[PDB]
From Swiss-Prot, chains A, B:
Protein's UniProt keywords contain Transport: no
Residue spans, topological domain Extracellular: 1-533, 590-597, 668-690, 749-751
Section covered of the full-length record: 25 to 827 of 1212
Function in brief: G-protein coupled receptor for glutamate. Ligand binding causes a conformation change that triggers signaling via guanine nucleotide-binding proteins (G proteins) and modulates the activity of down-stream effectors. Signaling activates a phosphatidylinositol-calcium second messenger system and generates a calcium-activated chloride current. Plays an important role in the regulation of synaptic plasticity and the modulation of the neural network activity.
Protein name: Metabotropic glutamate receptor 5
Disulfide topology: C33-C75, C194-C483, C229-C231, C318-C334, C372-C379, C464-C484, C468-C487, C490-C502, C505-C518, C597-C686
Chief place of localization: membrane
Species the sequence originates in: Homo sapiens (Human)
Protein's cellular compartments: Cell membrane
Membrane-topology annotation of the record: Multi-pass membrane protein
Binding site for L-glutamate: Y40, S105, S126, A127, T128, Y176, D258, K349
Ranges in the topological domain labelled Cytoplasmic: 557-566, 621-646, 713-725
Effect of E723A: Increased constitutive signaling activity
Gene Ontology terms for molecular function: A2A adenosine receptor binding; adenylate cyclase inhibiting G protein-coupled glutamate receptor activity; G protein-coupled receptor activity; G protein-coupled receptor activity involved in regulation of postsynaptic membrane potential; glutamate receptor activity; identical protein binding; neurotransmitter receptor activity involved in regulation of postsynaptic cytosolic calcium ion concentration; protein tyrosine kinase activator activity
Transmembrane regions: 534-556, 567-589, 598-620, 647-667, 691-712, 726-748, 752-773
Amino acid sequence: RRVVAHMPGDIIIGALFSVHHQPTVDKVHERKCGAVREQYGIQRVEAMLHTLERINSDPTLLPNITLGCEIRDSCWHSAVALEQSIEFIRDSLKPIVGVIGPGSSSVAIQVQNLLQLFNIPQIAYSATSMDLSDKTLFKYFMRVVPSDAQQARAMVDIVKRYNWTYVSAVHTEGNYGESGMEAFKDMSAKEGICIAHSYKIYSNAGEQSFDKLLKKLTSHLPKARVVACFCEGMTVRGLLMAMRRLGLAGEFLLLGSDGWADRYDVTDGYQREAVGGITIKLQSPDVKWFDDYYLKLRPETNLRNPWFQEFWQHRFQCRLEGFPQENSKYNKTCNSSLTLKTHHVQDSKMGFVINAIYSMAYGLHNMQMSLCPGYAGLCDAMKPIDGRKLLESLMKTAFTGVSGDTILFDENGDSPGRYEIMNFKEMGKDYFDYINVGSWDNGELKMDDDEVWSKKSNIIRSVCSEPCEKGQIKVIRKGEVSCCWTCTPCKENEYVFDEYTCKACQLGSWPTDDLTGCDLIPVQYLRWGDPEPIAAVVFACLGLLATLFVTVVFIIYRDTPVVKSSSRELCYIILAGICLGYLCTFCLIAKPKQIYCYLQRIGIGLSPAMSYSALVTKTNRIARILAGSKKKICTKKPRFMSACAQLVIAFILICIQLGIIVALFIMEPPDIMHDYPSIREVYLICNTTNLGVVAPLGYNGLLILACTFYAFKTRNVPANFNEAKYIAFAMYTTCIIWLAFVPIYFGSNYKAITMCFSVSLSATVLLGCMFVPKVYIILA
Amino acid sequence: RRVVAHMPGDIIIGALFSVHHQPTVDKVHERKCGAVREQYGIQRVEAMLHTLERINSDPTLLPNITLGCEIRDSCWHSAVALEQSIEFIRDSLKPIVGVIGPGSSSVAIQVQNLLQLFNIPQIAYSATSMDLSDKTLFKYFMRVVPSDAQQARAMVDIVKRYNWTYVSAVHTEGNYGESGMEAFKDMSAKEGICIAHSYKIYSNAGEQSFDKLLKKLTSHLPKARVVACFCEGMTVRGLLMAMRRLGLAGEFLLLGSDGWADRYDVTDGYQREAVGGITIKLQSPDVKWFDDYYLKLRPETNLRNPWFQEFWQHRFQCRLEGFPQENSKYNKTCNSSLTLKTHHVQDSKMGFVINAIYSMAYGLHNMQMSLCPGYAGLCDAMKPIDGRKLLESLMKTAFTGVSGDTILFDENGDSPGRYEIMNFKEMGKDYFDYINVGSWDNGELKMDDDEVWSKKSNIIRSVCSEPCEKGQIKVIRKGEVSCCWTCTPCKENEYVFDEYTCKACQLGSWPTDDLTGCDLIPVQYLRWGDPEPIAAVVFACLGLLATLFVTVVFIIYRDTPVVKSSSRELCYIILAGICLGYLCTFCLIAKPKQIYCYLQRIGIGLSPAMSYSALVTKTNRIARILAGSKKKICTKKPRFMSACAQLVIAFILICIQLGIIVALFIMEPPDIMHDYPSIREVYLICNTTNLGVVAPLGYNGLLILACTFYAFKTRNVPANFNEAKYIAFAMYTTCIIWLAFVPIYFGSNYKAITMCFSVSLSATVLLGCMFVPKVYIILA
Ligand SMILES: C[C@@H](NC(=O)c1ccc(C#Cc2cccc(F)c2)cn1)C(C)(C)O
Ligand SMILES: C[C@@H](NC(=O)c1ccc(C#Cc2cccc(F)c2)cn1)C(C)(C)O
Ligand SMILES: *[C@@H]1O[C@H](CO)[C@@H](O)[C@H](O)[C@H]1NC(C)=O
Ligand SMILES: *[C@@H]1O[C@H](CO)[C@@H](O)[C@H](O)[C@H]1NC(C)=O
Ligand SMILES: N[C@@H](Cn1oc(=O)[nH]c1=O)C(=O)O
Ligand SMILES: N[C@@H](Cn1oc(=O)[nH]c1=O)C(=O)O
């Protein structure tokens, strides 16, 4: 059988403290537990044994009745604790009216499942998992500490404050670890946090298991540099030992939990691997009277604690010769100068144990007051202490704890509590310590980012991918966790609306500077100004000046003998054609509008006919004068009427041209098209079809052929300075110029400027080859 | 307080059967159980009570000693079962040497946690969770059924066989449901399957909880029509009741598990909502000798079963007034005419219970034979039966079960087993039943897809997205479950490398049909055929005919005064230049090849330059001999240069042209560029560049300018048939022929046909306007 601590009293209160370490992986079946514990063992045992004495001494609490205890060792194991609980309830098969629950959540659950069948309230001081908050399954369970829902919140707040996204999760196999990690995973995946992989491991696992776990952790080392540990102290210690073994000294950031807290026994010897790690600790002020009592304990006088001799020998490596527990393993003896003061560290969860004991005592006191207000002691209506009544009294009892605050239980049996954020840092040389760097209280996460990471240099944030949101590059997530993405540029034609997809502008638009919204690229027109249009306007102006000068000379030299052979009316039509051609370019080089491109077409059509048809009829006559004279045998042939015939021949040729232009205008009406050659640029012009520029042009070319043919007939006939010869050069040059612009026209969409220049050149060639004699011959 | 079945014996075997239903959500704390169960209760109790008597009667098994029992009710609850186990082990604090474990996995775990402390082996018949396979925590636990890993595999196989990807998961709160659903999730999400959402719910949850669960399930109804239920019978029944209540009668296909199997008590009354459900059932042949004992049981004679009278009154709604149990609740009495034969259904797992009891008996037999081979009975070395020895003997025992096969335990305490796939179908009008449609045995899923869905119009597949392998249209996953994707068509330019990306080919290439891969664009070279090149070569042939005709006429009249005006050798290299220019056409329009690639270049370089050189060297003399004649003061220097030096002064600068063209040539070898004008088409051309084409052209232009200047010097001069004027006009028109094609060349693609036309035009205009006149009347 196992040894237990005893204390006589009227009412007996059970206890389950992990005096010894958890059984090793190979000694589980034998249910033998390992070395003695100081913080979790002897300290808590002494704390209870002294708190009971304090309660007994106090008259204002539980008067006239003394409180006893039966403290048993759980060895931090479910199997051992269940055995001890069976020993507790053996009498029910002095009764145990209540127990101070074990530290572990899984162990607490196992013990509660047995205790609830006998109506024995259980108060825990460190059991934290959310699973114990279910009063349907755990009616007789209370704790003086909050659930680990708040702890998971605090951890999520920590990971979100430092912009850690691609973290890794490790938790101890059990109930505390499982519940904690589930809650953390939920609240982390909710906001924006992603887990590379979740790993689980027993505390008492071998070296090989921890090595494999750390290899798996390092499999994501370059990216996931922060590990979320909902792990016990032994799990963290095993991780540190693995880090030491395989040569990791600070490329992980361990985010601890309540299990780690500020325990010095999890980092002793392996400090350098755990430096920089952040842990969450339940806030509990150090108890002073407990220290005053504890630091004066000696093995010689302290008999009521059965494990104290073993602990004394284990702490100061020595053998106590005078007592049965010699443990001759240790070499040296224990001199009478060893004190517990040296290297004394009180456990963090010391206030909670005293608070739990006080809560049980106050519950009993309240129930005793409520049952028999008159009698001072154990009234007859209590001797069979009813578990249900005690539970009901405990669920509503309130008192002032050792810390100074008021302790009360909510509907779920929990108690209010706040957390302290501690960062493991190196103070000096070969001197590490836990430093308080923040707190968490009902949602607010106060922190001190100056103490943690002295320099802005903060542990490379656990990010699965660098921010791809810079410019045109777009985010594409693969068939993996939706926190890292491939960063790809989508073509500049497109713009990014969603971070994960981009679309292009329809036909005539472009993305803005920010690549959020098309900008409808500006339309380019012919634009008065620009070198080539200015040259066109200059040429048009000079041409118009020449035309008006020639017209002036003609309307001054009306009926001069020299100008009598040519048809005066027909020459008027010639000048009209030339002037209209010169006006056509002025109309054409401009902003396209309905009004402008209504009459640019009639210009380009009518002018080269209104001149060239009249030239045809003029040359025809001047040939008929000579061609008819070749025979000179007998010709009563006034077939063609001097001018009468010539003018109507004109007014029919020009009118058929006008008819064809009007038809081509009617069937194809002019609109202001916004033709899009490329996605880059947008132009606007009036709709021209192939027909609209090939039919009138073809007809004009036919007139060119007619004039040239007739000019070749007449060639070098003696005339007034041989004007027919001038017509010869006129038509030769006109045909050459017409043939010259074919490539540039049917090559570049430079339709407008080439058309303008062609019309101007054709006009100036006539205005030159003709009238040149008329300007200086008559000048003579 | 709770009743117990008894049977006297030397060795007592415990049992835990769920005789009554699970305590209701209100009465959990009072641990008062529900109504009686037939399949899971009385039938199993009677099975044990009869199989023990069969074993006792058998002389070849457990000889000379009797086997007793102590059957207790667990009410399918962990709290009640723990109390009953405490009652079991109270004697250890006649001992119970071992128990036949409870049906539920969680309940089995709770019972085992207590039993392993007292070395009491536990054999389960329906516990299936994987958690019980861990011998570290459950050393004294064995099962005659396989773990639920195989069950999860079977379910994954079922969902894989029917294209189901986007399913929803439900599991019962507990250990069986949790382990099953975790295993299923792992092996489903691993391979190809998707889960819309995983839901958990307690079996004894209220109507409201089931309503909320079904609302959440319907929230994904259009896409996820298959529900994977790793749920108990009561959970499935609750789901069916919810479906009936909110009028959901065929939307879902429930995929059951061992909990459902082919139980008629989970679908009775609510058949119409469960039709078309597929369930997995552990194969176990019906035990024939059990029926012949069970069907003859009557309440009057069966006194050894404490629950039999209550069950009799519950099954046939009647009050057995005669007996202590009357339960007035049932109005009518029962005549002595009701038999268990009517509506008799033996449960699926009757074979497993009998096999477990036989396993325990055979274990005891083997251990007895090993301990004392000589004595037949309870030898003195066996009075304190050791649990460890019994466990060791049980872990290696093998025997023949009721079915006929051999029952043995592996290292983990499990047993081999095969699964049977059952389908809930409507056979006839007002008739439903389970139909065996498949099996699963060590990864082999033999199904019959004809009995289920007797057509091709099966259940709408639980798929989130239709197969989007439609040509290009890639898949884009939107952060949620891979399963659900949008469809974007990817650009013609590019093709699909994988399902999730589309990349473009090289600078010159096209994706093949159905965008599968990539191909090479055929090179469409400038064919010897085609519309334009045939005209070009016709023109070249006519030009060459002109050259040979002119050369012939020159050879006919060599020393005639009408020809002997200038150096006849100059008007030999003129024709040489013309011929070479015409040959440039033939050496240009062809397949771009190494040889032709320099031939064309040397042609275009030398020929026009060398022709115009000789024209220059003729015209300077013909101008200067009369330029000096204009003044003629003395000018008695007939030589100057003149004489036959003309040929030398032409040839030196022709060699200069050859030198410069060789200079351009040495930089660029006659290779072929694969010019890419657009993404769609690929062309090939010679290695000519801007620098390699603009220098010889520029030099030739300089010669053109020089010759034009000299032609302007001469123009109209009286000589033999007036050569100068015609050649001057020829050069004038040539100057602008050289300029017409410039825009459509330097920046174009058809720069071969343009060259072909330009050289021919320049050749005809230079020949037809230089020699033609001289040879027009060459006859005279
Ligand atoms: C560019 C194109 N040219 C023309 O489409 C065109 C149209 C009209 C004229 C003219 C004229 C003219 C002539 C004399 C007097 C006058 F007022 C006007 C020239 N070219 C082609 C034929 C390819 O060269
Ligand atoms: C098409 C192109 N023209 C030429 O690159 C080119 C090169 C050579 C000639 C010639 C010639 C010729 C002239 C007389 C006799 C003879 F044998 C050959 C014309 N154009 C550009 C510059 C755009 O005008
Ligand atoms: C974390 O949050 C954002 C991430 O860019 C940034 O504004 C902030 O400075 C980061 N760092 C800290 C210490 O908050
Ligand atoms: C989907 O099911 C069909 C038959 O129901 C069959 O082609 C195969 O099992 C599945 N399809 C594929 C592509 O595997
Ligand atoms: N809340 C923790 C308590 N605790 O865990 C440890 O590892 N030490 C310790 O005190 C748990 O539920 O286990
Ligand atoms: N397979 C279940 C057992 N079981 O659940 C039911 O609903 N019926 C039944 O036999 C388990 O492993 O706990």
